[PDB]
Write an enzyme that holds these catalytic residues in place. Structure first.
Site, PDB file in Angstrom:
ATOM      1  CB  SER A  19     -32.510  -8.506  13.499  1.00  0.00           C
ATOM      2  OG  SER A  19     -32.458  -7.388  12.445  1.00  0.00           O
ATOM      3  CB  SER A  21     -33.177  -6.740   8.541  1.00  0.00           C
ATOM      4  OG  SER A  21     -32.539  -6.247   9.617  1.00  0.00           O
ATOM      5  CB  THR A  94     -34.895  -5.916  14.638  1.00  0.00           C
ATOM      6  OG1 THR A  94     -34.429  -6.574  13.644  1.00  0.00           O
ATOM      7  CG2 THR A  94     -33.888  -4.486  14.967  1.00  0.00           C
ATOM      8  CG  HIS A 260      22.379  18.141   7.845  1.00  0.00           C
ATOM      9  ND1 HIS A 260      21.755  17.149   7.958  1.00  0.00           N
ATOM     10  CD2 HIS A 260      21.488  19.149   7.205  1.00  0.00           C
ATOM     11  CE1 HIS A 260      20.585  17.150   7.287  1.00  0.00           C
ATOM     12  NE2 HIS A 260      20.573  18.340   6.760  1.00  0.00           N
ATOM     13  CG  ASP A 308      22.972  14.749  10.021  1.00  0.00           C
ATOM     14  OD1 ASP A 308      22.906  15.832  10.737  1.00  0.00           O
ATOM     15  OD2 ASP A 308      22.538  14.954   8.844  1.00  0.00           O
ATOM     16  CB  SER A 426      17.390  18.053   6.478  1.00  0.00           C
ATOM     17  OG  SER A 426      17.497  17.612   5.463  1.00  0.00           O
TER      18      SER A 426
END
Ligand SMILES: *[C@@H]1O[C@H](CO)[C@@H](O[C@@H]2O[C@H](CO)[C@@H](O)[C@H](O)[C@H]2NC(C)=O)[C@H](O[C@@H]2O[C@H](CO)[C@@H](O)[C@H](O)[C@H]2NC(C)=O)[C@H]1NC(C)=O
Ligand SMILES: *[C@@H]1O[C@H](CO)[C@@H](O[C@@H]2O[C@H](CO)[C@@H](O[C@@H]3O[C@H](CO)[C@@H](O)[C@H](O)[C@H]3NC(C)=O)[C@H](O)[C@H]2NC(C)=O)[C@H](O)[C@H]1NC(C)=O
Ligand code: NAG
Ligand code: NAG
Length: 492
Positions: A19, A21, A94, A260, A308, A426
């Protein structure tokens, strides 16, 4: 709430106020917000259709749930991105009523084509979102259209869930708060009307507009992006290992971690009932047999973390939930679909997809459960990141070549402002986020400075060696991963 679940279908209707606005700038912040909601709504792999309607004096349908392409996210984003504010240059009022009656007619059309008697029609739940300053000025009261919609959808006490209406005023502009509030649904315990300053505030609010609580299948890499969600909700694959180490759920029974870190073993998984989680016993533990920390010790490398990697088979299956979910692993079909990549992608393609830049933002989770930030260094920046281990003469008194400690098996971060993992961090996931989904690219293995030795110290800039962090890279571990998990996970 907008419900995220496997049963049924969701039609989402995105209504953009064009719109007089609103400036073409306001309008672009609407498009930006709608875009985000679409990408978020398509992240959960659910059955969803998106309608796209811009509106001022009259409604303009850019995409309709009646079109097949409304279930296709590229079509949706493109129908949306081809929205011009100036398409409404001749009727700049709107007309909120007419925008919602536009959704009413789409619903009437759909019910007509499917049949009001079929499950195809009746299992559909419907969420309307208007992006507007909410200043209707023509067309009559929108309540007439909301009531037509409640009626065609046969919304009763038992069907409250089949319809949500949101009215959201996002951006700079002045908003009528009574219109918004009168637009949105009136449900006990929840908001359907919001005044928000940018698309970043929408992101967070959208997280709480979604209801993912009944999503309990094994979908990987799904999480909460709210700053106000708990730590576990944000990273539900995250588990605690008491042999302290961390780990990641990669399935409903299997947990990935570091060798580990290792009958009396406990694993704490997420649980929606408690911040405390839920305890599980191990049935089976597979520790890479190449792992041996003192393998190079007599030759002057006093700790070596090659291979690991370890897997834990929990003694019972985890129930999936907002608090317990697997992370996605690259090089699986599930990761492939989360990344929206071509079907015959290879593991090399996933690696290129995820780790293409020379500095890749990534995360690991803190002892306290916080998500911390790192940048993974790739290519020539991997070499310089990794180089600093030549400064570390106590651990590595006899290091001829950097690669005797930092092999090709490791990712490298911890430079500049990165956080550095602590000792009990870890084995936890080194992960990243891509299209709102989470992928594990590595696991925390080792580094040169331990900040925890809630509270983390920063190294002195004069400390030698500086902090530096080395993560077992999952793209280097596929043979072993496939050997133990080929019947657990679906590898490319
Ligand atoms: C210091 O590290 C180097 C690099 O790994 C070691 O020397 C290497 O040893 C391997 C065999 O283990 C050999 O194939 C390489 O040619 C050699 N690399 C280089 C560039 O020198 C040293 O290892 C020790 O030194 C002698 C000299 O090479 C070896 O014969 C010996 O096996 C080994 N010493 C013992 C008995 O442990 C290493 N220096 C030390 C003090 O460990
Ligand atoms: C990010 O996390 C938010 C924080 O947990 C999530 O929002 C929570 O959603 C829940 C499910 O929709 C609400 O749960 C309750 O469940 C019953 C269902 O029958 C309702 O009636 C209750 O009223 C409701 N809770 C109560 C007792 O008030 C939570 O209320 C809600 N919490 C907040 C702060 O909004 C988000 O869904 C989540 N986002 C994503 C994308 O996962
Ligand atoms: C608005 O009106 C003019 C004149 O009739 C027309 O040429 C123009 O293309 C119209 N704009 C739109 C978006 O239809
Ligand atoms: C957890 O640790 C992070 C990083 O140290 C910190 O900034 C955050 O506030 C901590 N959380 C709590 C619960 O205090």
């Amino acid at each position: 709430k907008i419900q995220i679940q496997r049963s049924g279908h969701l039609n989402l209707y995105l209504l953009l106020d064009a719109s007089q606005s609103v400036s073409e700038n306001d309008f672009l912040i609407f498009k930006e917000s709608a875009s985000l909601m679409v990408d978020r709504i398509f992240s959960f792999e659910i059955n969803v259709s998106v309608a796209i309607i811009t509106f001022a004096s009259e409604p303009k349908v850019l995409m309709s749930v009646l079109n097949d392409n409304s279930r296709d996210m590229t079509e949706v984003i493109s129908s949306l991105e081809n929205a011009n504010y100036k398409d409404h240059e001749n009727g700049t009022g709107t007309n909120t009523y007419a925008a919602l009656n536009s959704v009413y007619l789409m619903m009437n059309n759909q019910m007509r084509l499917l049949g009001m008697e079929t499950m195809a029609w009746q299992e559909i739940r419907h969420a309307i979102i208007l992006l507007t300053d909410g200043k209707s000025n023509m067309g009559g009261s929108p309540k007439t259209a909301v009531d037509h919609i409640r009626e065609i959808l046969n919304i009763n006490q038992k069907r409250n869930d089949y319809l949500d209406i949101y009215a959201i005023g996002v951006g700079k502009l002045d908003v009528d708060w009574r219109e918004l509030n009168e637009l949105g649904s009136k449900k006990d315990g929840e908001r359907h009307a919001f005044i928000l300053q940018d698309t970043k505030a929408l992101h967070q609010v959208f997280e709480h507009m979604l209801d993912v609580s009944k999503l309990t299948d094994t979908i990987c890499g799904v999480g909460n992006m709210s700053a106000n969600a708990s730590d576990q909700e944000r990273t539900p694959w995250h588990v605690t290992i008491k042999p302290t180490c961390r780990g990641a759920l990669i399935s409903d029974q299997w947990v990935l971690t570091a060798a580990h870190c290792f009958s009396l073993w406990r694993v704490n998984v997420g649980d929606p009932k408690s911040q405390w989680g839920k305890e599980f016993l191990i049935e089976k533990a597979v520790i890479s047999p190449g792992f041996d920390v003192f393998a190079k010790k007599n030759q002057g490398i006093l700790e070596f973390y090659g291979d690991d990697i370890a897997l834990l088979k929990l003694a019972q299956k985890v129930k999936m939930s907002t608090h317990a979910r697997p992370i996605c692993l690259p090089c699986t079909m599930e990761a492939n679909l989360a990344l929206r990549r071509p079907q015959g992608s290879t593991c090399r393609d996933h690696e290129n997809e995820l780790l293409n830049k020379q500095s890749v933002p990534a995360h690991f989770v803190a002892l306290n459960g916080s998500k911390l930030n790192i940048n993974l260094k790739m290519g020539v920046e991997w070499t310089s990141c990794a180089e600093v281990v030549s400064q570390e003469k106590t651990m590595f008194p006899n290091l001829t070549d950097v690669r005797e400690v930092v092999t090709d098996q490791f990712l490298c971060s911890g430079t500049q402002e990165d956080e550095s993992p602590c000792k009990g961090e870890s084995g936890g996931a080194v992960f990243l986020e891509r299209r709102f989904r989470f992928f594990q690219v590595g696991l925390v293995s080792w580094g040169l400075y331990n900040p925890c030795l809630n509270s983390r110290k920063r190294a002195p800039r004069s400390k030698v060696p500086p902090p530096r962090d080395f993560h077992i890279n999952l793209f280097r571990m596929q043979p072993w991963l496939r050997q133990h998990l080929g019947d657990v996970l679906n590898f490319l």
